[PDB]
Scaffold this motif. Structure first.
Motif, mmCIF file in Angstrom:
data_model
loop_
_atom_site.group_PDB
_atom_site.id
_atom_site.type_symbol
_atom_site.label_atom_id
_atom_site.label_comp_id
_atom_site.label_asym_id
_atom_site.label_seq_id
_atom_site.Cartn_x
_atom_site.Cartn_y
_atom_site.Cartn_z
ATOM 1 N N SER A 113 -7.086 1.605 -8.989
ATOM 2 C CA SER A 113 -6.853 1.690 -7.544
ATOM 3 C C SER A 113 -6.802 3.143 -7.055
ATOM 4 N N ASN B 122 -6.360 -1.912 -4.792
ATOM 5 C CA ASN B 122 -4.976 -1.663 -4.389
ATOM 6 C C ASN B 122 -4.163 -2.934 -4.461
ATOM 7 N N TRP C 137 0.787 -1.221 0.000
ATOM 8 C CA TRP C 137 0.000 0.000 0.000
ATOM 9 C C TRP C 137 0.835 1.297 0.000
ATOM 10 N N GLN D 81 -3.819 4.180 -5.986
ATOM 11 C CA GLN D 81 -2.376 4.196 -5.945
ATOM 12 C C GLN D 81 -1.856 4.741 -7.263
#
Ligand SMILES: [Cl-]
Lengths: 233, 234
Positions: free
Chosen positions: B57, B87, B24, B59
């Motif tokens: 995601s 994620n 993460w 991210q």
């Protein structure tokens, strides 16, 4: 006190901002891109955070937004696109410079189209190079037959922009979400007109700077507490 | 076929180079990662693909991959939906460590066991971990419940949180006829492939999707592949 931020995109390719770029899907010029970079940086230094972003479905605005979110390290934000935040549809005038415009339509019609708030430009003719490019682009496929503009006065643009602000953006703000809008001169003009209660005259007279974050402090009824503020130097 | 579905793993991250476990952690693309995404997008353009909605995601490696693809295929106007449910797997305490540090600390046995198990999580990422506040106190996870916020995940965990999103947000789009592009991560995508193809736990661990390459599914009325996944490119 709610904080609201707007930002107009800067220079488009091939001098298109000076050629009624309208609904033509022009990209930023490298300069317009850099301007978005400065705006991003200004927002980074002031330490601004957002919770949600609004933009048009036109690539120059979208790219401005991407640049900003990148600069402020908030690329994970939710983003909502809408034709309702689009630039004016300049119809048949799209792609043309001042001279070309006057040559095609005469000095009279032209000066009328400049001085007016509610007189539309003429619509795209089938021989206009942007004809199918714009009017048959699938990004507007969902629009009703009577909703798909072919030409817009400032008043039209503002009329189709306001309900989105009302239905979609105003709810986010009342819930306390911090909103960034990345858009265009005329749609942003719709919003500013609603916010400060300006007249037609006033709104046509106002030119929002490009590439600069515009900040509003808003009270509980969403009314501005101060004049608009700019970020930078 | 009946439905077209395209998946793509984010291109090479800056930490992928350093061989650091990210999970993460919000590592950005490397320049090579960027060119990978650019190539994938160019391939999607040359084949004439058109999409209607995009999932990714929260991210930036996945997000940036997506941006690059949409730039390439000239579809920056598409709706884009982000969710933490896509994620990368949460690698717990291994986050920020490289393979050397990992081996050195736990032993080769244990690291093997980890990356070969479908069901066993890495150690949890505890409050004194160098990346605890960075990940756990990030405002982008503020709306997560206590239960939802991992301290670490096995593949089974990651899959378990990814699929509800697939079922609830993506499946409805596909059955409406919307052409869907999902730009995510190897492990969350693994979740999706495992579901689509009904692979075994054993036969999903061995499955390795490369960074930056468009993957194509042609599904039918039951959202099952009519043929094996096609890679897209040169
Ligand atoms: Cl986006």
């Amino acid at each position: 006190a709610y904080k609201l931020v707007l930002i107009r995109h800067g220079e488009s390719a091939w001098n298109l901002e000076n050629r009624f770029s309208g609904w033509y899907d022009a990209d930023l010029s490298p300069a317009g891109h850099e301007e978005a970079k400065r705006g991003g940086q200004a927002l980074r230094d002031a330490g601004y955070e957002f919770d949600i972003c609004f933009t048009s479905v036109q690539k120059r605005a979208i790219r401005t937004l991407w640049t900003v979110l990148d600069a402020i390290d908030q690329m994970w934000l939710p983003v909502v696109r809408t034709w309702r935040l689009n630039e004016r549809h300049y119809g048949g005038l799209t792609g043309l410079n001042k001279a070309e415009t006057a040559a095609k339509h005469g000095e009279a019609q032209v000066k009328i189209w400049r001085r007016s708030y509610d007189v539309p430009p003429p619509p795209m003719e089938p021989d206009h190079p942007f004809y199918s490019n714009i009017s048959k682009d699938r990004r507007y496929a969902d629009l009703t037959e009577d909703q798909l503009p072919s030409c817009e006065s400032l008043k039209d643009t503002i009329a189709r922009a306001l309900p989105f602000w009302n239905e979609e953006i105003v709810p986010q703000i009342k819930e306390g979400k911090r909103v960034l809008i990345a858009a265009h001169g005329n749609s942003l003009r719709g919003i500013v007109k609603h916010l400060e209660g300006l007249s037609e005259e006033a709104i046509m007279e106002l030119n929002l700077p490009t590439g600069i974050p515009i900040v509003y402090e808003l009270d509980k009824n969403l009314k501005p507490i101060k004049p608009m503020q700019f970020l930078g130097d």
